[PDB]
């Protein structure tokens with residue numbers, strides 16, 4: 001069940017999944033529609049679901065990782081697609097081998113240096129590239 005802010009923007013949560021507290025390498029996942037493209041893992045909040053809980057759930061489902069939830073980075077809008085995403089830091093401590101989206105749609109995941117994550121996100125997901133700006 002999709003959820004929405006009062007202005008009709010779809011509510012989402014996502015994590016920047018870092019390998020370590022150094023925050024030098026981040027986990028991206030393949031686009032569901034275009035698997036040769038990379039995205040930051042995330043998705044819709046469920047009814048009455050805390051944003052931090054949604055963020056952790058979505059990265060388990062999409063990226064097959066768990067870890068230590070860190071700070072809220074910020075709340076980011078995509079004007080064209082009308083969605084608003086809470087973006088958290090997650091320090092990955094567990095990497096699972098056969099996660100929901102790997103099994104269901106063959107979703108891929110890969111570690112990127114921050115500068116390379118920004119590069120591959122820029123063309124189709126410039127708002128996601130902007131998560132890393134600070």
Ligand SMILES: O=P(O)(O)O[C@H]1[C@H](OP(=O)(O)O)[C@@H](OP(=O)(O)O)[C@H](OP(=O)(O)O)[C@@H](OP(=O)(O)O)[C@H]1OP(=O)(O)O
Nearest residue numbers: 002010012030031032033034039042043044062081082083
């Ligand atoms: O841009 P929207 O209209 O909100 O639609 C998006 C988009 O799907 P499209 O392929 O239809 O543009 C995402 O696909 P990608 O970012 O992977 O290319 C998809 O993401 P995922 O399948 O990766 O989860 C996302 O879902 P979400 O916001 O839950 O991450 C889905 O929105 P819906 O699930 O609400 O249709």
Ligand SMILES: [Cl-]
Nearest residue numbers: 020023024025
């Ligand atoms: Cl790191």
Ligand SMILES: [Cl-]
Nearest residue numbers: 078125127128
């Ligand atoms: Cl976006």
Ligand SMILES: [Mg+2]
Nearest residue numbers: 042043044062
């Ligand atoms: Mg998603």
